[PDB]
Coordinates of C-alpha atoms and ligand atoms in Angstrom, one line a residue:
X1 CA 158.1 96.4 121.2
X2 CA 160.2 98.5 118.8
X3 CA 162.8 95.7 118.4
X4 CA 163.0 91.9 118.5
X5 CA 161.3 91.4 121.9
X6 CA 162.9 90.8 125.3
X7 CA 163.2 87.0 125.8
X8 CA 163.5 86.4 122.0
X9 CA 166.7 85.5 120.2
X10 CA 168.0 84.6 116.8
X11 CA 171.0 83.0 115.0
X12 CA 172.4 83.7 111.6
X13 CA 171.3 80.4 110.0
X14 CA 172.2 81.1 106.4
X15 CA 175.4 83.1 106.8
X16 CA 176.6 85.3 103.8
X17 CA 180.0 84.4 102.4
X18 CA 180.4 81.9 105.2
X19 CA 177.9 79.0 105.1
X20 CA 178.6 76.5 102.3
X21 CA 176.2 74.4 100.4
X22 CA 177.0 71.1 98.6
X23 CA 177.5 72.3 95.0
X24 CA 177.3 69.5 92.4
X25 CA 179.8 69.8 89.6
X26 CA 178.6 68.7 86.1
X27 CA 180.4 65.4 86.7
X28 CA 178.4 64.4 89.8
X29 CA 181.4 65.5 92.0
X30 CA 180.5 67.4 95.1
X31 CA 182.2 70.3 96.7
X32 CA 181.3 72.6 99.6
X33 CA 181.0 76.1 98.0
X34 CA 180.7 79.5 99.8
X35 CA 177.6 81.5 98.9
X36 CA 177.6 85.3 98.6
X37 CA 174.0 85.9 99.6
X38 CA 171.1 83.9 100.9
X39 CA 167.7 85.4 100.0
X40 CA 164.0 84.7 99.6
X41 CA 163.4 82.7 102.8
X42 CA 160.6 80.2 103.6
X43 CA 160.4 78.1 106.7
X44 CA 157.7 75.3 107.1
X45 CA 157.0 72.2 109.2
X46 CA 156.9 68.8 107.5
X47 CA 155.8 66.0 109.8
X48 CA 157.7 67.6 112.7
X49 CA 160.7 68.5 110.6
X50 CA 161.6 72.1 110.1
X51 CA 162.5 72.8 106.4
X52 CA 164.1 76.2 105.6
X53 CA 164.2 77.0 101.8
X54 CA 166.2 79.7 100.2
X55 CA 167.9 81.2 97.2
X56 CA 171.7 80.4 97.3
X57 CA 173.0 83.4 95.3
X58 CA 176.5 82.1 94.9
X59 CA 178.4 85.0 93.4
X60 CA 176.2 88.1 93.9
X61 CA 173.0 89.3 95.5
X62 CA 171.6 90.4 92.1
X63 CA 168.5 88.9 90.7
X64 CA 170.1 88.0 87.4
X65 CA 173.0 85.9 88.6
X66 CA 174.0 82.3 89.3
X67 CA 171.5 80.9 91.8
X68 CA 170.3 77.5 93.2
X69 CA 167.7 76.5 95.7
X70 CA 169.2 75.6 99.0
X71 CA 167.6 73.8 101.9
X72 CA 168.4 73.4 105.5
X73 CA 166.3 70.9 107.5
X74 CA 166.2 70.1 111.2
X75 CA 164.6 67.4 113.4
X76 CA 165.3 69.1 116.6
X77 CA 163.7 72.6 116.3
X78 CA 166.9 74.2 115.3
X79 CA 169.5 72.6 117.5
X80 CA 171.1 71.1 114.4
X81 CA 170.6 71.3 110.7
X82 CA 171.6 69.4 107.5
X83 CA 172.2 71.3 104.2
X84 CA 171.2 70.4 100.6
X85 CA 170.8 71.8 97.2
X86 CA 167.2 70.9 96.5
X87 CA 167.1 72.4 93.0
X88 CA 169.9 72.8 90.5
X89 CA 169.9 75.5 87.8
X90 CA 170.3 74.5 84.1
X91 CA 174.0 75.5 84.1
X92 CA 173.4 77.1 80.6
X93 CA 175.4 80.2 81.4
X94 CA 177.0 82.1 84.3
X95 CA 173.6 83.6 85.1
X96 CA 171.5 80.4 85.0
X97 CA 169.2 80.4 88.0
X98 CA 166.4 78.7 89.8
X99 CA 164.7 81.2 92.2
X100 CA 161.9 82.6 94.2
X101 CA 160.6 79.5 95.8
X102 CA 156.9 79.1 96.7
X103 CA 156.2 76.1 98.8
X104 CA 153.2 73.9 99.7
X105 CA 153.4 71.1 102.4
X106 CA 151.0 68.2 102.2
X107 CA 151.6 65.1 104.4
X108 CA 155.2 64.2 104.2
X109 CA 155.6 66.0 100.8
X110 CA 157.0 69.4 99.9
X111 CA 155.9 71.0 96.6
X112 CA 158.3 73.7 95.4
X113 CA 157.6 76.0 92.5
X114 CA 160.4 78.2 91.1
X115 CA 161.3 80.3 88.2
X116 CA 164.1 78.9 86.1
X117 CA 166.2 81.0 83.8
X118 CA 169.1 80.2 81.5
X119 CA 170.8 83.4 80.1
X120 CA 169.0 86.7 80.5
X121 CA 170.5 89.5 82.4
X122 CA 167.5 91.7 82.7
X123 CA 164.3 91.4 84.7
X124 CA 161.7 88.8 83.9
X125 CA 158.8 91.2 83.4
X126 CA 160.8 93.0 80.7
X127 CA 161.9 89.9 78.7
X128 CA 161.1 90.0 75.0
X129 CA 159.2 86.7 75.4
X130 CA 159.2 83.6 77.6
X131 CA 162.0 81.8 75.8
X132 CA 164.6 82.0 78.5
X133 CA 162.1 80.9 81.2
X134 CA 160.5 77.7 82.7
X135 CA 158.3 77.4 85.8
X136 CA 159.6 74.3 87.6
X137 CA 157.7 72.2 90.1
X138 CA 159.8 70.0 92.4
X139 CA 158.5 67.5 94.9
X140 CA 160.5 66.6 98.0
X141 CA 159.6 63.7 100.3
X142 CA 160.4 63.8 104.0
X143 CA 161.3 60.5 105.7
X144 CA 161.9 60.1 109.4
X145 CA 163.4 57.3 111.6
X146 CA 165.1 57.1 114.9
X147 CA 168.4 55.8 116.1
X148 CA 168.8 54.7 119.8
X149 CA 166.6 57.5 121.2
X150 CA 167.6 60.1 118.6
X151 CA 165.4 60.9 115.6
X152 CA 166.9 61.4 112.2
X153 CA 165.5 62.5 108.8
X154 CA 166.3 62.6 105.1
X155 CA 164.7 64.5 102.3
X156 CA 164.6 63.1 98.8
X157 CA 164.2 65.6 96.0
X158 CA 162.7 64.6 92.7
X159 CA 163.5 65.8 89.1
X160 CA 162.0 69.2 88.2
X161 CA 158.9 69.2 86.0
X162 CA 158.2 72.1 83.7
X163 CA 154.6 73.5 83.9
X164 CA 155.2 75.6 80.9
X165 CA 153.0 73.4 78.6
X166 CA 150.2 74.0 81.0
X167 CA 150.5 77.8 80.8
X168 CA 147.8 79.4 78.5
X169 CA 148.9 81.7 75.8
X170 CA 146.2 84.2 76.7
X171 CA 143.9 85.1 79.5
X172 CA 140.7 86.8 78.6
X173 CA 142.5 88.8 75.9
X174 CA 145.8 89.1 77.8
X175 CA 148.8 87.6 75.9
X176 CA 150.9 85.7 78.5
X177 CA 154.7 85.8 78.8
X178 CA 155.9 84.2 82.0
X179 CA 154.6 83.3 85.5
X180 CA 156.2 82.4 88.8
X181 CA 154.9 81.5 92.2
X182 CA 153.9 84.4 94.6
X183 CA 156.9 83.5 96.9
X184 CA 156.8 81.9 100.2
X185 CA 154.5 79.5 101.9
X186 CA 151.2 78.7 100.1
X187 CA 148.7 76.1 101.2
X188 CA 146.6 73.0 100.9
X189 CA 142.9 74.2 101.1
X190 CA 140.5 72.4 103.4
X191 CA 139.2 70.5 100.4
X192 CA 142.7 69.1 99.9
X193 CA 143.6 71.2 96.8
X194 CA 147.2 72.3 96.3
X195 CA 146.8 76.1 96.0
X196 CA 149.6 78.4 94.5
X197 CA 149.0 82.1 94.1
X198 CA 151.0 83.1 91.1
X199 CA 152.2 86.3 89.5
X200 CA 151.9 86.6 85.7
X201 CA 153.7 89.0 83.3
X202 CA 151.9 89.8 80.0
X203 CA 153.7 90.6 76.8
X204 CA 153.6 94.3 77.3
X205 CA 155.1 93.6 80.7
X206 CA 152.1 94.2 83.0
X207 CA 152.0 92.1 86.2
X208 CA 148.9 90.6 87.8
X209 CA 148.1 87.6 90.0
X210 CA 145.9 84.5 89.8
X211 CA 145.3 81.2 91.5
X212 CA 146.9 78.0 90.0
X213 CA 145.5 74.9 91.9
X214 CA 145.6 71.2 91.7
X215 CA 142.8 68.8 92.8
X216 CA 144.9 65.7 92.4
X217 CA 148.1 66.2 94.4
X218 CA 150.0 67.9 91.7
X219 CA 149.2 65.7 88.7
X220 CA 147.3 68.4 87.0
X221 CA 147.0 72.1 87.4
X222 CA 144.4 74.6 86.6
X223 CA 144.5 78.4 86.4
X224 CA 141.4 79.8 88.0
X225 CA 139.4 82.4 86.0
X226 CA 139.8 85.4 88.3
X227 CA 142.7 87.9 88.7
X228 CA 143.9 91.0 90.5
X229 CA 144.1 94.5 89.1
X230 CA 147.3 95.0 87.0
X231 CA 150.3 96.1 89.2
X232 CA 150.0 93.3 91.8
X233 CA 152.8 90.9 92.3
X234 CA 154.2 88.4 94.8
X235 CA 150.8 87.3 96.1
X236 CA 150.5 85.4 99.4
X237 CA 147.4 83.3 100.0
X238 CA 145.7 81.7 103.0
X239 CA 142.3 80.2 103.6
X240 CA 139.9 82.0 105.9
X241 CA 136.3 80.8 106.7
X242 CA 135.8 79.1 103.4
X243 CA 137.6 81.7 101.3
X244 CA 141.0 82.3 99.8
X245 CA 142.5 85.6 100.9
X246 CA 145.1 86.9 98.5
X247 CA 147.5 89.6 99.8
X248 CA 149.4 91.3 97.1
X249 CA 152.7 93.1 96.8
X250 CA 152.0 96.5 95.1
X251 CA 155.0 98.6 94.1
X252 CA 154.2 102.3 94.4
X253 CA 150.8 102.1 96.0
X254 CA 149.0 100.4 98.9
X255 CA 148.6 96.7 99.1
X256 CA 145.5 95.2 97.5
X257 CA 143.8 92.2 99.2
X258 CA 141.1 90.1 97.5
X259 CA 138.8 87.3 98.7
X260 CA 137.4 84.4 96.6
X261 CA 134.8 81.9 97.7
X262 CA 135.1 79.7 94.7
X263 CA 138.7 78.6 94.5
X264 CA 139.8 81.7 92.6
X265 CA 137.0 81.8 89.9
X266 CA 135.8 85.1 91.1
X267 CA 137.8 87.7 93.1
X268 CA 136.4 90.6 95.1
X269 CA 138.5 93.3 96.7
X270 CA 138.5 93.0 100.5
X271 CA 137.4 96.6 101.0
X272 CA 135.6 95.8 104.3
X273 CA 138.6 94.2 105.9
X274 CA 142.2 94.1 104.8
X275 CA 142.6 95.8 101.4
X276 CA 144.8 98.9 101.6
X277 CA 145.6 98.5 105.3
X278 CA 149.3 97.7 104.6
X279 CA 151.7 99.5 102.3
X280 CA 155.4 99.8 101.2
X281 CA 156.6 102.8 103.1
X282 CA 155.3 105.9 105.0
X283 CA 154.5 107.7 101.7
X284 CA 153.4 104.5 99.8
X285 CA 155.3 105.6 96.7
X286 CA 158.2 103.2 97.1
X287 CA 159.1 99.7 95.9
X288 CA 157.1 97.2 97.8
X289 CA 158.3 94.0 99.5
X290 CA 157.3 90.4 99.8
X291 CA 155.2 89.5 102.9
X292 CA 154.4 86.2 104.6
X293 CA 150.7 85.6 105.3
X294 CA 149.8 82.6 107.3
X295 CA 146.8 81.2 109.1
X296 CA 147.4 79.8 112.6
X297 CA 145.5 78.8 115.7
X298 CA 146.5 80.4 119.0
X299 CA 144.8 79.7 122.3
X300 CA 142.1 78.0 120.3
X301 CA 141.4 80.9 118.1
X302 CA 142.1 81.0 114.4
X303 CA 144.1 84.1 113.4
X304 CA 146.2 85.5 110.5
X305 CA 149.8 86.5 110.8
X306 CA 151.3 89.1 108.4
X307 CA 154.9 90.3 108.1
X308 CA 156.2 93.4 106.4
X309 CA 159.0 96.0 106.8
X310 CA 158.1 99.6 107.7
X311 CA 160.9 100.6 105.2
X312 CA 161.4 104.0 106.8
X313 CA 164.6 104.2 104.8
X314 CA 162.9 103.7 101.4
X315 CA 163.6 101.7 98.3
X316 CA 164.9 98.2 98.9
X317 CA 166.4 99.0 102.4
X318 CA 163.3 97.4 104.0
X319 CA 164.1 98.2 107.6
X320 CA 162.0 97.4 110.6
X321 CA 160.2 94.2 109.9
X322 CA 156.9 94.1 111.7
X323 CA 154.5 91.3 112.6
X324 CA 150.8 91.8 112.7
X325 CA 148.1 89.5 113.9
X326 CA 144.4 89.8 112.8
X327 CA 141.2 87.8 113.1
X328 CA 139.7 89.7 110.0
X329 CA 138.2 92.3 112.3
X330 CA 140.8 93.6 114.8
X331 CA 144.4 94.0 113.6
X332 CA 147.1 94.0 116.3
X333 CA 150.7 95.2 115.7
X334 CA 152.8 92.5 117.6
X335 CA 155.7 94.8 117.0
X336 CA 159.2 94.8 115.4
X337 CA 160.8 91.4 114.9
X338 CA 164.0 92.7 113.2
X339 CA 166.7 94.5 115.4
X340 CA 167.0 98.2 115.8
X341 CA 167.3 99.9 112.5
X342 CA 168.9 97.1 110.5
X343 CA 167.9 96.5 106.9
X344 CA 165.7 93.4 106.7
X345 CA 163.6 92.3 103.8
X346 CA 161.8 89.1 102.7
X347 CA 160.4 87.0 105.5
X348 CA 158.7 83.8 106.7
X349 CA 156.8 82.9 109.9
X350 CA 156.0 79.5 111.4
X351 CA 154.0 78.3 114.4
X352 CA 155.1 74.8 115.3
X353 CA 154.4 72.8 118.4
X354 CA 153.2 75.9 120.3
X355 CA 156.4 77.8 119.4
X356 CA 156.8 80.8 117.0
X357 CA 159.7 81.4 114.6
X358 CA 160.7 83.5 111.7
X359 CA 163.3 83.1 108.9
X360 CA 164.0 86.5 107.4
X361 CA 166.6 88.5 105.5
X362 CA 169.1 90.9 107.0
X363 CA 171.1 93.1 104.6
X364 CA 174.4 95.0 105.0
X365 CA 175.7 96.6 101.8
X366 CA 173.6 94.2 99.7
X367 CA 175.1 91.1 101.1
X368 CA 172.3 89.1 102.7
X369 CA 172.0 86.5 105.4
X370 CA 168.9 84.7 106.8
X371 CA 168.4 84.8 110.5
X372 CA 166.3 82.1 112.2
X373 CA 164.4 83.8 115.0
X374 CA 162.7 82.4 118.1
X375 CA 159.7 84.7 118.7
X376 CA 159.3 84.0 122.4
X377 CA 158.3 87.4 123.7
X378 CA 156.1 88.0 120.6
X379 CA 154.1 84.8 121.1
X380 CA 153.5 85.7 124.8
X381 CA 152.0 89.1 123.8
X382 CA 150.0 87.3 121.0
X383 CA 148.5 84.8 123.4
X384 CA 147.6 87.6 125.8
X385 CA 145.8 89.6 123.0
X386 CA 144.0 86.5 121.8
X387 CA 142.7 85.8 125.3
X388 CA 141.6 89.4 125.6
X389 CA 139.6 89.0 122.3
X390 CA 137.9 85.7 123.2
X391 CA 137.1 86.9 126.7
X392 CA 135.4 90.2 125.7
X393 CA 133.6 88.5 122.7
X394 CA 132.3 85.7 125.0
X395 CA 131.3 88.2 127.7
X396 CA 129.2 90.3 125.3
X397 CA 127.8 87.2 123.5
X398 CA 126.7 85.9 126.8
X399 CA 124.7 88.9 128.0
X400 CA 121.0 88.2 128.4
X401 CA 119.3 91.1 126.4
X402 CA 115.7 92.0 126.7
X403 CA 113.2 89.9 124.9
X404 CA 111.3 92.0 122.3
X405 CA 107.6 91.9 121.5
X406 CA 106.9 89.3 118.8
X407 CA 114.9 83.6 128.2
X408 CA 116.8 86.3 126.3
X409 CA 116.6 88.6 123.2
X410 CA 119.1 88.4 120.4
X411 CA 122.8 88.5 121.4
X412 CA 124.7 91.7 121.7
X413 CA 126.3 91.7 118.2
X414 CA 130.0 90.7 118.1
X415 CA 130.6 89.6 114.5
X416 CA 132.5 92.4 112.8
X417 CA 133.0 94.2 116.1
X418 CA 136.4 96.0 115.6
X419 CA 137.0 98.4 118.5
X420 CA 135.4 99.4 121.8
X421 CA 136.0 102.4 124.0
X422 CA 134.6 101.9 127.5
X423 CA 135.8 102.2 131.0
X424 CA 139.6 102.1 130.9
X425 CA 141.0 105.6 130.2
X426 CA 144.2 107.2 131.5
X427 CA 145.8 110.6 130.8
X428 CA 145.5 111.4 127.2
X429 CA 144.4 107.9 126.1
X430 CA 141.0 106.2 125.8
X431 CA 141.8 102.5 125.6
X432 CA 140.6 100.1 122.9
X433 CA 139.1 97.2 124.9
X434 CA 140.4 95.1 121.9
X435 CA 144.0 96.5 122.4
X436 CA 144.6 97.6 118.8
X437 CA 143.7 101.3 118.3
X438 CA 143.2 103.7 121.2
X439 CA 141.6 107.1 120.9
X440 CA 143.5 110.3 121.8
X441 CA 141.8 112.5 124.4
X442 CA 141.8 116.1 125.6
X443 CA 140.0 118.1 128.3
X444 CA 138.2 115.1 129.7
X445 CA 137.2 113.7 133.1
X446 CA 136.6 110.0 133.7
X447 CA 133.1 108.7 134.3
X448 CA 131.8 105.1 134.5
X449 CA 132.4 103.5 131.0
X450 CA 133.7 106.7 129.4
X451 CA 134.4 110.4 129.4
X452 CA 132.9 113.7 130.2
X453 CA 134.2 116.6 128.1
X454 CA 134.8 120.1 129.3
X455 CA 137.1 122.6 127.7
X456 CA 138.3 123.8 124.3
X457 CA 138.8 120.8 122.1
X458 CA 137.2 118.6 124.8
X459 CA 136.8 115.2 123.1
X460 CA 138.5 112.2 121.6
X461 CA 140.0 111.3 118.2
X462 CA 139.8 107.7 117.0
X463 CA 142.4 107.7 114.2
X464 CA 141.5 106.4 110.8
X465 CA 143.8 107.8 108.0
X466 CA 145.5 109.5 111.0
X467 CA 146.9 106.1 111.9
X468 CA 149.5 107.0 109.2
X469 CA 151.4 104.3 107.3
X470 CA 149.4 101.2 108.4
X471 CA 145.6 102.0 108.3
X472 CA 143.8 99.4 110.3
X473 CA 140.4 101.2 110.1
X474 CA 140.7 101.6 106.3
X475 CA 137.5 99.4 106.1
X476 CA 135.4 102.3 107.3
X477 CA 135.8 104.2 104.0
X478 CA 133.6 101.4 102.6
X479 CA 131.3 100.7 105.5
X480 CA 131.0 101.1 109.3
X481 CA 128.7 101.3 112.2
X482 CA 129.7 103.6 115.1
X483 CA 127.7 103.3 118.3
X484 CA 127.7 105.4 121.5
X485 CA 125.7 106.4 124.6
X486 CA 125.6 110.1 125.3
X487 CA 124.2 112.9 127.4
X488 CA 124.3 116.5 126.5
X489 CA 125.4 118.3 129.7
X490 CA 125.1 122.0 128.7
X491 CA 123.4 123.9 125.9
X492 CA 125.6 124.9 123.1
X493 CA 125.9 128.5 121.8
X494 CA 124.7 127.5 118.3
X495 CA 125.6 124.0 116.9
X496 CA 128.1 121.7 118.4
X497 CA 129.6 118.3 117.4
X498 CA 128.8 115.1 119.2
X499 CA 129.9 112.0 117.1
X500 CA 131.0 111.3 113.5
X501 CA 133.5 110.6 110.8
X502 CA 135.7 113.4 109.6
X503 CA 137.4 113.5 106.1
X504 CA 141.0 114.2 105.1
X505 CA 141.3 117.4 103.1
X506 CA 140.8 121.1 103.2
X507 CA 138.0 122.5 105.3
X508 CA 136.4 120.6 108.1
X509 CA 134.3 118.1 106.1
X510 CA 132.5 115.1 107.5
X511 CA 131.4 111.9 105.8
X512 CA 128.6 111.3 108.4
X513 CA 127.9 112.6 111.9
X514 CA 125.6 114.0 114.5
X515 CA 125.6 117.5 116.0
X516 CA 123.0 119.2 118.4
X517 CA 121.9 122.8 118.8
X518 CA 120.8 125.7 121.1
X519 CA 117.1 124.9 120.2
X520 CA 117.5 121.3 121.6
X521 CA 117.3 119.8 118.2
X522 CA 119.5 117.2 116.4
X523 CA 121.6 118.1 113.4
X524 CA 122.5 114.9 111.6
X525 CA 125.2 115.5 109.0
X526 CA 125.1 113.5 105.7
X527 CA 128.2 114.0 103.7
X528 CA 128.3 117.5 102.4
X529 CA 124.5 118.4 102.5
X530 CA 123.3 121.3 104.7
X531 CA 122.8 119.9 108.3
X532 CA 119.1 120.9 108.9
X533 CA 117.6 120.5 112.4
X534 CA 115.1 117.8 113.4
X535 CA 113.5 116.2 116.4
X536 CA 114.0 117.2 120.1
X537 CA 116.2 116.2 123.0
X538 CA 116.5 117.1 126.7
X539 CA 119.6 118.1 128.7
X540 CA 121.1 115.4 130.9
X541 CA 119.0 112.6 129.3
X542 CA 120.9 109.5 128.1
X543 CA 120.6 108.9 124.4
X544 CA 121.7 105.9 122.3
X545 CA 123.4 107.0 119.0
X546 CA 124.2 104.9 116.0
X547 CA 125.8 105.9 112.7
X548 CA 125.7 103.5 109.8
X549 CA 127.4 103.9 106.4
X550 CA 127.3 101.4 103.6
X551 CA 126.6 101.5 99.8
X552 CA 127.8 105.1 100.0
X553 CA 124.6 105.8 102.1
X554 CA 124.4 107.1 105.7
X555 CA 121.8 106.8 108.4
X556 CA 121.7 108.3 111.9
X557 CA 119.8 106.7 114.7
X558 CA 118.8 108.0 118.1
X559 CA 117.2 105.6 120.6
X560 CA 116.9 102.9 117.9
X561 CA 115.0 105.1 115.5
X562 CA 116.3 106.8 112.3
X563 CA 116.5 110.6 112.1
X564 CA 115.0 112.5 109.2
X565 CA 117.4 112.4 106.2
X566 CA 118.6 108.9 106.9
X567 CA 119.4 106.8 103.9
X568 CA 120.9 109.6 102.0
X569 CA 124.0 109.3 99.8
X570 CA 127.0 110.6 101.7
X571 CA 129.7 110.3 99.0
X572 CA 129.6 110.6 95.3
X573 CA 131.7 109.1 92.5
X574 CA 133.8 105.9 92.7
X575 CA 136.8 107.2 94.6
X576 CA 136.6 105.7 98.2
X577 CA 136.2 108.4 100.8
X578 CA 139.3 109.1 102.9
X579 CA 138.2 109.2 106.6
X580 CA 140.7 111.0 108.8
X581 CA 139.2 109.9 112.1
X582 CA 136.1 109.3 114.2
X583 CA 135.5 112.2 116.5
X584 CA 133.7 111.9 119.9
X585 CA 132.6 115.1 121.4
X586 CA 134.4 118.2 119.9
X587 CA 138.1 117.4 119.6
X588 CA 140.3 119.9 117.8
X589 CA 143.9 121.2 117.9
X590 CA 143.1 124.2 115.7
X591 CA 140.3 125.9 113.9
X592 CA 137.2 127.0 115.8
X593 CA 137.6 126.6 119.5
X594 CA 134.9 124.0 119.9
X595 CA 133.8 123.1 123.4
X596 CA 131.1 120.5 123.3
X597 CA 129.7 119.8 126.8
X598 CA 128.8 116.1 126.6
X599 CA 129.5 112.8 128.2
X600 CA 130.1 109.8 126.0
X601 CA 130.3 106.1 127.0
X602 CA 130.7 102.7 125.4
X603 CA 131.7 103.7 121.9
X604 CA 131.5 100.7 119.7
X605 CA 132.9 100.2 116.1
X606 CA 131.8 97.6 113.6
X607 CA 133.2 96.9 110.1
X608 CA 129.8 96.5 108.6
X609 CA 126.4 98.1 108.6
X610 CA 124.4 96.5 111.5
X611 CA 120.9 95.4 110.6
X612 CA 117.8 96.9 112.3
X613 CA 117.4 94.0 114.7
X614 CA 121.1 94.4 115.7
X615 CA 120.7 98.1 116.3
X616 CA 117.6 97.6 118.5
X617 CA 119.5 95.0 120.5
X618 CA 122.3 97.5 121.2
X619 CA 119.7 100.1 122.1
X620 CA 118.1 97.7 124.6
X621 CA 121.3 96.5 126.2
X622 CA 123.3 99.7 126.5
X623 CA 123.4 99.6 130.3
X624 CA 124.8 96.0 130.0
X625 CA 128.0 96.2 127.8
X626 CA 130.3 98.4 129.8
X627 CA 133.7 97.2 131.1
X628 CA 132.7 99.1 134.3
Ligands
LIG701 C1 162.2 87.0 89.4 C2 162.7 88.2 90.2 O1 163.3 89.3 89.5 N1 162.4 88.2 91.4 C3 162.8 89.2 92.4 C4 161.8 90.3 92.5 C5 161.3 90.9 91.2 O2 162.4 91.3 90.4 C6 160.5 92.2 91.4 O3 159.2 91.9 91.9 C7 160.2 92.8 90.0 O4 159.2 92.1 89.3 O5 162.3 91.3 93.4 C8 162.9 91.0 94.4 C9 163.1 92.0 95.4 O6 164.1 91.9 96.4 O7 162.3 93.0 95.4 C10 163.4 89.6 94.8 C11 163.0 88.6 93.7 O8 164.1 87.6 93.6

């Protein structure tokens, strides 16, 4: 869906220059005051109560203006709401502000962390020092009760506490200036820790992120030792399989994602999963945007939800907010949750009592509202995809493979299984059994579990960099295993392509691949080295092919055994390769008029290098995995 889905709907919950908030004058007096713009949305669930948190930018939408933290809460899933000012600014000047809320929910408590400023008119990373700033922590307590039938709630907000005295003056050399939460919903780890991802500006104005956590419900806080590269900001964190996953805003480049198994002490870039998948615009050289990043359980499966604008317009327009869902292997684009080509921006997502919602910005002429969205259609699609994933994984995991010489052998490998091209194919499309990334086809005829190629450019292109803006197979530049069953149907004139990974760039370069020749020999291709012939094959005979790439090394297996040359380095230097696509057969839209006469079935893709036992299992069970 290229627009908020059929069945879904929204209301303008925080309405620009319309909705009022109970502004408290210096004398305790209270007056309902109109607010120019509502920005920086977060929506969470506290003990069955929806709490929507936001910047109330009273006079203008500008960052350096008079702002307070507004809250709207509901006990009836959005039928009705009450409004509060949860956090007052210092009132030091006409630009005093409390802003950019980051929120953790634990039990009936809300922990809110905001940046507080008194009088500066320029941007926080460019301040001369931290004198105008304070990081404020505020705790809110939700209390329920019920009239005759009807439930009601109140939220009591405490006095802000400055965490500035807890901020180190330096980090491993780095002289600190200010810090603020990463924006949005953060978490309680499974060990009960309060975990805030934060963004830190150093004196020279560099930005980087770290984890600030509490083991005692907010009494004390610690800054973990690890950090992101410089240039990361507005970090969002979630917990996945015993690790923190930190998803960073990165202005002017692709988004960096890190993992930490030790509560932030050590960070490692998520090169084999999520790092660099998402970005700020088609060309990636634009201002980035905040993203929500939340772990949920759908149809019994744990998954991650990620939101971000395509920003086809560029700069801060932030049009076309999308929602993605991933289980750390497959990444599914649920679609566009904003409407048409409206400008959106910062966002929040929440799964509560089996219903999906979003609170996000809409922007016309830099006057901003927050819409509260019921993601009905989206959730239906999501549930269907999750069921597809569980069902195929369980099916493959349940196959009885041959016992090997030492009831069944080891399971058909499913951990790290990203995509699968098998039986379903139609027109110019070879369908991903996992419903995320299809392959594009030309000059093919359907056969059981795959395709037979015949004609110029006969073959399939499984896009990698060619996915474009969002690169869901970006992991392959770091490591992959590509598997397939093949037959060579006709002898080639000289050398013809069968399977591999192509590289972006001039020429027709390959990272790793396999070709075959007129002498009936294999020609494995290892990076840029001369592809010399080895071995022997026979026309028509089915062969199992596996390509593995990890640690910048490449191996090619036929029938479970490595071909000569395997284990060689395929890429040099430290710059990640830039794979354009995986080719199957001899696809082309130009260049040599390649016509590889081969039939390929059951092409499997993993985001790791499979071990030798796993490879043999696949070789032994190849007539068992097809979708039929
Ligand atoms: C404290 C502050 O300025 N926060 C603002 C943030 C920041 O300025 C930028 O990340 C440069 O560091 O930008 C944006 C934004 O719509 O992109 C909204 C935040 O309110």
